[PDB]
Amino acid sequence: SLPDLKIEKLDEGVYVHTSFEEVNGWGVVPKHGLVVLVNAEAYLIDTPFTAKDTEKLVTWFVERGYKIKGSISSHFHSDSTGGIEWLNSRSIPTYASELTNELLKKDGKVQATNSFSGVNYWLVKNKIEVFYPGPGHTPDNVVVWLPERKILFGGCFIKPYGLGNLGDANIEAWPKSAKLLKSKYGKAKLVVPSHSEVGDASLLKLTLEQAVKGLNESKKP
Ligand SMILES: Cc1oc(C)c(S(N)(=O)=O)c1C(=O)O
Ligand code: NA
Ligand SMILES: [Zn+2]
Ligand SMILES: [Zn+2]
């Protein structure tokens, strides 16, 4: 009864995948991830919520002649990681930061088979970069940068109009983290949030404004 998985071309070699979940209070929430094509290899930037939609996504690309080389999950929540177990079962390399894999284990979830540490990580040299801005939406949240098309996948860190689910947030750190991201990716042409429409570098400033207001709200009784 949920909207079908969507796959829409965003730019040369870049697709947005949109999967849907009902979230109590938030309604029917779209989740955007990317598929990035390097040569004839496909990289999932976040998995759909479900194994079934992860399989539909993979099959769509494989039928068109792309080889699934890996997934990277931007944070531990199921809107980024729901398909890791299914990918693992198909011997598709899954990636997450050491911190994301720690928070997956803490949450009783299947871990990524491959991990990385530190602040900047090249999943694919000169094509797909992982950057940790610091804690915000979650302690582990990372962004994914595509240097060639100047596309930033913000995941659930980019929150231009409201912060959404604060359950795992570090509201004290989020402003400092958003200042760092804003300083690093002003050159972004496209910024792709998890749960709202694609925009431009202005989404980094709007996110900073929301983080500052969230921290203020957290200090009220
Ligand atoms: C709107 C929304 O729905 C869900 C299911 C999430 S998350 N990434 O916290 O699970 C959020 C969010 O704030 O990212
Ligand atoms: Na794997
Ligand atoms: Zn989340
Ligand atoms: Zn989310």
Numbering used by the authors: 3 to 223
Study authors write:
Production of metallo-β-lactamases (MBLs), which hydrolyze carbapenems, is a cause of carbapenem resistance in Enterobacteriaceae. The genes encoding MBLs, including IMP, NDM, and VIM types, have become widely prevalent via bacterium-specific transferable genetic apparatuses such as plasmids. We report here that sulfamoyl heteroarylcarboxylic acids (SHCs) can competitively inhibit the globally spreading and clinically relevant MBLs (i.e., IMP-, NDM-, and VIM-type MBLs) at nanomolar to micromolar orders of magnitude. X-ray crystallographic analyses revealed the inhibition mode of SHCs against MBLs; the sulfamoyl group of SHCs coordinated to two zinc ions, and the carboxylate group coordinated to one zinc ion and bound to positively charged amino acids Lys224/Arg228 conserved in MBLs.
Lineweaver-Burk plots demonstrated that SFC behaved as a competitive inhibitor with a submicromole-level Ki value for IMP-1 (0.22 μM) and micromole-level Ki values for NDM-1 and VIM-2 (9.82 μM and 2.81 μM, respectively). We carried out X-ray crystallographic analyses of IMP-1–SFC complexes. The overall structure of IMP-1–SFC complexes is shown in Fig. 3A; one SFC molecule was found to bind to the active site, scaffolding two zinc ions (Zn1 and Zn2). The sulfamoyl and carboxylate groups of SFC were clearly assigned with respect to the electron density observed. The details of the mode of binding of SFC to IMP-1 are revealed in an enlarged image, wherein the nitrogen atoms of the sulfamoyl group can be seen to located nearly equidistantly and to be coordinated with Zn1 and Zn2 (2.0 Å), which is where the hydroxyl anion for a nucleophilic attack was originally located in the native IMP-1 structure. Asp120 forms hydrogen bonds with the sulfamoyl group of SFC (2.8 Å), and the carbonyl oxygen of the sulfamoyl group is also hydrogen bonded to the nitrogen atom of the Asn233 side chain (2.9 Å). The spatial position of the Asn233 side chain shifted toward the zinc ions after the introduction of SFC. The carboxylate oxygen O1 of SFC coordinates with Zn2 (2.1 Å), and O2 interacts with the amide of Asn233 (2.9 Å) in the protein backbone and amino group of Lys224 (3.0 Å), which are conserved across B1 MBLs. Additionally, the methyl group (C6) at the 2-position of SFC is stacked in the cavity between Trp64 and His263, and this methyl moiety is likely stabilized via CH/π interactions through Trp64 and His263.
